[PDB]
Amino acid sequence: GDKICLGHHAVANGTKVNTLTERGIEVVNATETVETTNIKKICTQGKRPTDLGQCGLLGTLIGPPQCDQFLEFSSDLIIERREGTDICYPGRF
Amino acid sequence: AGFIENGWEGLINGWYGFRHQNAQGEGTAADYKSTQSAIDQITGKLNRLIGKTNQQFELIDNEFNEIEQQIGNVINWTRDAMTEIWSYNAELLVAMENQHTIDLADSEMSKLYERVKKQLRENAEEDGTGCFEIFHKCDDQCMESIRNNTYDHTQYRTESLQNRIQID
Amino acid sequence: AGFIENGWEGLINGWYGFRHQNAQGEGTAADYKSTQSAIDQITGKLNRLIGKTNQQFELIDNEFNEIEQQIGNVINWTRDAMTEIWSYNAELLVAMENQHTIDLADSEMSKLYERVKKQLRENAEEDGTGCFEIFHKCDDQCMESIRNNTYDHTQYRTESLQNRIQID
Amino acid sequence: AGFIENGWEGLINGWYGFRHQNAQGEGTAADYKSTQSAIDQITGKLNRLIGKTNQQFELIDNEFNEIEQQIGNVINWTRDAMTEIWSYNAELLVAMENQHTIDLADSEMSKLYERVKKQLRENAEEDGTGCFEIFHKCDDQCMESIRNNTYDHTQYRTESLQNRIQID
Amino acid sequence: QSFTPNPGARRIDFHWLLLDPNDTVTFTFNGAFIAPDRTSFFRGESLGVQSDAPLDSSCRGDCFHSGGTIVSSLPFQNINSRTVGKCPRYVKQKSLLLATGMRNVPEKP
Numbered sequence A: 001g002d003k004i005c006l007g008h009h010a011v012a013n014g015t016k017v018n019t020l021t022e023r024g025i026e027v028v029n030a031t032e033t034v035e036t037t038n039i040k041k042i043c044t045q046g047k048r049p050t051d052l053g054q055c056g057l058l059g060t061l062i063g064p065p066q067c068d069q070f071l072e073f074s075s076d077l078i079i080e081r082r083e084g085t086d087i088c089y090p091g092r093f
Numbered sequence B, C, D: 001a002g003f004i005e006n007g008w009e010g011l012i013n014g015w016y017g018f019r020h021q022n023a024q025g026e027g028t029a030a031d032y033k034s035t036q037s038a039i040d041q042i043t044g045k046l047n048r049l050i051g052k053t054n055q056q057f058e059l060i061d062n063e064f065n066e067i068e069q070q071i072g073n074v075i076n077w078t079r080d081a082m083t084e085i086w087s088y089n090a091e092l093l094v095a096m097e098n099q100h101t102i103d104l105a106d107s108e109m110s111k112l113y114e115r116v117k118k119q120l121r122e123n124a125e126e127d128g129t130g131c132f133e134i135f136h137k138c139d140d141q142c143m144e145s146i147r148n149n150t151y152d153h154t155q156y157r158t159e160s161l162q163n164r165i166q167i168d
Numbered sequence E: 001q002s003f004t005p006n007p008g009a010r011r012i013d014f015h016w017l018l019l020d021p022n023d024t025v026t027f028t029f030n031g032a033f034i035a036p037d038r039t040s041f042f043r044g045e046s047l048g049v050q051s052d053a054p055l056d057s058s059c060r061g062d063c064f065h066s067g068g069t070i071v072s073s074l075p076f077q078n079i080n081s082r083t084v085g086k087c088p089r090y091v092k093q094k095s096l097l098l099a100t101g102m103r104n105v106p107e108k109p
């Protein structure tokens, strides 16, 4: 006359996961462990970075004119950019 | 006149809520502790994975410049091979966690079948779809009894004997 | 006068064929659906493995010539280390699949024990070797009843009561 | 007047020793074969791990000298990455072995619950804490009967009927 | 180490050494030597990120890569194989869904 029926929280069509037995098994509730959200700006909540710009990182030890202000510095983050260079006169390390 | 079966129900009241098919027209959910036991283990699965991946990395390749191609080919090959190794490990690990999560869900529900069976002993007939047919006047009070673990064949069996007993 | 036990039999009629020891001298195999359920999962195991290995490869080492030995030593070491990693992964994965296959076989048979138990309720005594002692005249028709899922204690228990009942 | 429960006891007599709560004041341990079955599998776990790790190694890095730093960075990176891969494999493998060991312990005890249940059929009430309440005069001889597998409801049920039977 | 210049191309070759405390670095000059006026000391574990992204004073995160940052509470990422700082691992699996509950035995029979 009365029943005890164990429910599975079966919501309207959801998503699917890969398991050790079968692939594409539909599950009620899941989360993605791989984030694809690319935040296109650099986080600076800490010791603000040395944004070298036209200056390269090695340039800070040599002193190209674009690096003159970065010859002595401190931060928890250092940023290099494509336009950056470590020389004015040809050279390498 | 529904043929009440596994309480899929589009249920919103907890992950492991159980339907109580009271003849009076009820659909109340299960003791939250069953759901909570699942929550206590499943929500921590993400953190277990994080501890295995959160490592310090540094640049090997100078992306804006060029490294000797022979070495760069070794590095690219190595990274790609390692990517496949880690992708394999990731897929396998996630698959293990998914299979274990399913196994856990089945195991917890299995324990809930046991809770009913051990307490009622004879009047809990399993339909294999999560349903127990109850052979006594199991109104909301019996649902409270189940949730409060006062459900006991000592008295409930007798109540069912009034409805089920055969002497021969 | 064999002591019929787990139907090893050198059986050819399906992987999970069950012996029906009809007193009249029969040895018919089980419902193919049990075997089919195993087939549906096991035959796909190879494909699951293939999807994890079938990758594009290119030559890194010029086999007919020579590469700088220092790099070649790194490559050989790397490949060998990766070979051990993949060999480990392969042995582990295969071992997992083998253990799971065994677990599946035990699980399916367990379900078949359950099929008999849930349908007969009292007259199915398990010997622990795959055998159920049946306490009624279980001729070929009962085997058909099992395979057709018409096996039901509602009538079969009564048939056994004629052979088993004790009133006191 | 202890409320005898799972025989934690600070037991020294075997890993899977079971307490027999004889009303006469006994605490004898279980049949060693249960413990031996665990020993036969668990002690070999170390050897299974050894066979997967015992490999021939040679020096790649000249520790007392210097190798070109660009290659050395690749080697250090490679070794470190492989160390994490093997550390992951080691933690995972050990965790698998630990989980399997626990599962084995639970499985073996489960079999021992089954040994009691299948032999006594009605007078073995499980408390969920490893304890069976026995409804007959189960003195040391019944413990011997259990260990010798002569424990049998054919006679023991009748002994309990003298203490338990209800006719109605 | 000894060095000599090789004429035939204008170039400055920079060479470097990490000098231990209490040690003395000795230099011998016969010309073609560009001498340092100052030396360098390191102070506090920076993260040298190579990137084209703009800076943001409100953004917080540990992971940096050439296209930006990765801010998450997840173990894996598909954004870039080359990251700096403490990060989730790169995989080829663009979508690894982890179940957080029971399978969806379908709402409708």
Ligand SMILES: *[C@@H]1O[C@H](CO)[C@@H](O)[C@H](O)[C@H]1NC(C)=O
Binding pocket: A011, A028, A029, A030, A031, E100
């Ligand atoms: C399933 O999990 C997601 C995870 O983000 C959550 O947002 C969602 O509400 C859950 N669904 C439920 C509880 O029905």
Ligand SMILES: *[C@@H]1O[C@H](CO)[C@@H](O)[C@H](O)[C@H]1NC(C)=O
Binding pocket: B068, B069, B070, B072, B073, B076
């Ligand atoms: C290494 O891979 C990057 C892309 O990830 C590619 O741009 C680079 O040229 C590759 N290096 C070589 C030597 O091919």
Ligand SMILES: *[C@@H]1O[C@H](CO)[C@@H](O)[C@H](O)[C@H]1NC(C)=O
Binding pocket: C068, C069, C070, C072, C073, C076
């Ligand atoms: C690398 O291994 C191959 C065999 O697979 C061997 O012939 C070759 O000489 C090895 N390379 C070096 C530098 O030893």
Ligand SMILES: *[C@@H]1O[C@H](CO)[C@@H](O)[C@H](O)[C@H]1NC(C)=O
Binding pocket: D068, D069, D070, D072, D073, D076
């Ligand atoms: C490689 O690691 C060792 C320590 O294991 C370190 O002494 C050595 O300098 C490293 N090689 C390079 C090129 O940094």
Ligand SMILES: *[C@@H]1O[C@H](CO)[C@@H](O)[C@H](O)[C@H]1NC(C)=O
Binding pocket: E021, E022
């Ligand atoms: C450095 O040399 C001086 C010489 O007076 C000595 O006192 C000092 O302790 C030295 N430092 C170390 C680290 O040896």
